[PDB]
Amino acid sequence: GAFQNLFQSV
Amino acid sequence: PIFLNVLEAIEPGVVCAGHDNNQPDSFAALLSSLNELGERQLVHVVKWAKALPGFRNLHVDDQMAVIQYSWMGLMVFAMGWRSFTNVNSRMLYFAPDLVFNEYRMHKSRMYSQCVRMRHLSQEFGWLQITPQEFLCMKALLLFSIIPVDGLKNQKFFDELRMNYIKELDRIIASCSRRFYQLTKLLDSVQPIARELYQFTFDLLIKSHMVSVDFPEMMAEIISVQVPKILSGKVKPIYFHTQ
Numbered sequence: 001g002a003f004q005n006l007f008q009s010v
Numbered sequence: 011p012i013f014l015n016v017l018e019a020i021e022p023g024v025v026c027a028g029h030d031n032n033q034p035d036s037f038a039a040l041l042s043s044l045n046e047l048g049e050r051q052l053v054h055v056v057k058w059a060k061a062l063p064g065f066r067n068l069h070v071d072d073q074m075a076v077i078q079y080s081w082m083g084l085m086v087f088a089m090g091w092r093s094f095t096n097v098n099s100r101m102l103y104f105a106p107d108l109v110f111n112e113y114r115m116h117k118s119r120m121y122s123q124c125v126r127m128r129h130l131s132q133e134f135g136w137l138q139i140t141p142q143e144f145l146c147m148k149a150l151l152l153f154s155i156i157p158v159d160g161l162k163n164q165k166f167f168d169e170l171r172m173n174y175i176k177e178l179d180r181i182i183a184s185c186s187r188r189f190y191q192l193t194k195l196l197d198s199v200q201p202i203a204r205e206l207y208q209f210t211f212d213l214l215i216k217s218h219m220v221s222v223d224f225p226e227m228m229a230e231i232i233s234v235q236v237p238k239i240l241s242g243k244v245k246p247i248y249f250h251t252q
């Protein structure tokens with residue numbers, strides 16, 4: 001989930 | 011020129027690796043720093059990609075996928091450009107604090123791959139590639155690798171890719187020779203990225219035996235996404251037949 005977390009955090 | 015305005019406006023600035031240049035070069039130190047640099051650059055690549063014209067037309071799943079497949083090519087291409095503009099391709103300018111001379115190319119155990127990246131850097135000079143050509147080409151790299159079985163909404167991707175190709179053609183607009191040359195250069199990035207993906211995958215698997223540190227996102231992406239590429243489930247889109 002680390003990439004997704006970055007992507008959604010902008 | 012709206013499209014070029016945007017590409018210039020969103021282009022990431024300088025990213026440092028955090029490498030300790032006071033310590034002697036070692037395989038583990040150089041690779042750990044490259045890995046950290048990848049982690050740092052990933053943040054910039056995401057912010058950049060999400061701000062590209064039309065990027066939000068894609069299904070969100072596909073937005074995340076194309077970044078996770080294309081990052082190596084994007085980063086290598088940008089690094090080749092930095093190397094060209096900063097040191098006339100005499101060295102690989104990974105970052106201001108991580109510049110590879112031949113000794114580091116050897117010590118990284120990636121000499122063959124570094125050779126190919128330096129060759130790519132030289133092409134920017136040999137072809138007299140303009141900053142505006144570079145920007146358009148780099149944007150197109152984001153849309154140059156997809157699953158063989160297709161994306162969540164392939165139609166939206168196809169349309170977006172088509173438009174980035176058109177934008178590259180208009181910045182070119184001898185024109186046929188130029189477009190052939192630039193598409194050949196673009197194609198050349200992909201086999202280099204593949205070799206680097208193989209190298210980094212193998213390194214991750216044995217990382218605990220060679221004291222190489224992989225940050226969180228790099229380890230995830232290299233174990234979850236990169237194997238799709240290496241196993242042939244995700245493949246580059248080539249302009250020309252290889």
Ligand SMILES: C[C@]12CC[C@H]3[C@@H](CCC4=CC(=O)CC[C@@]43C)[C@@H]1CC[C@@H]2O
Nearest residue numbers: 044045047048051085086089104206210
């Ligand atoms: C993946 C990798 C770390 C990240 C590197 C990559 C080489 C290409 C590269 C160029 C950059 O400018 C950012 C870091 C990256 C993206 C390295 C090859 C082996 C190492 O594990």
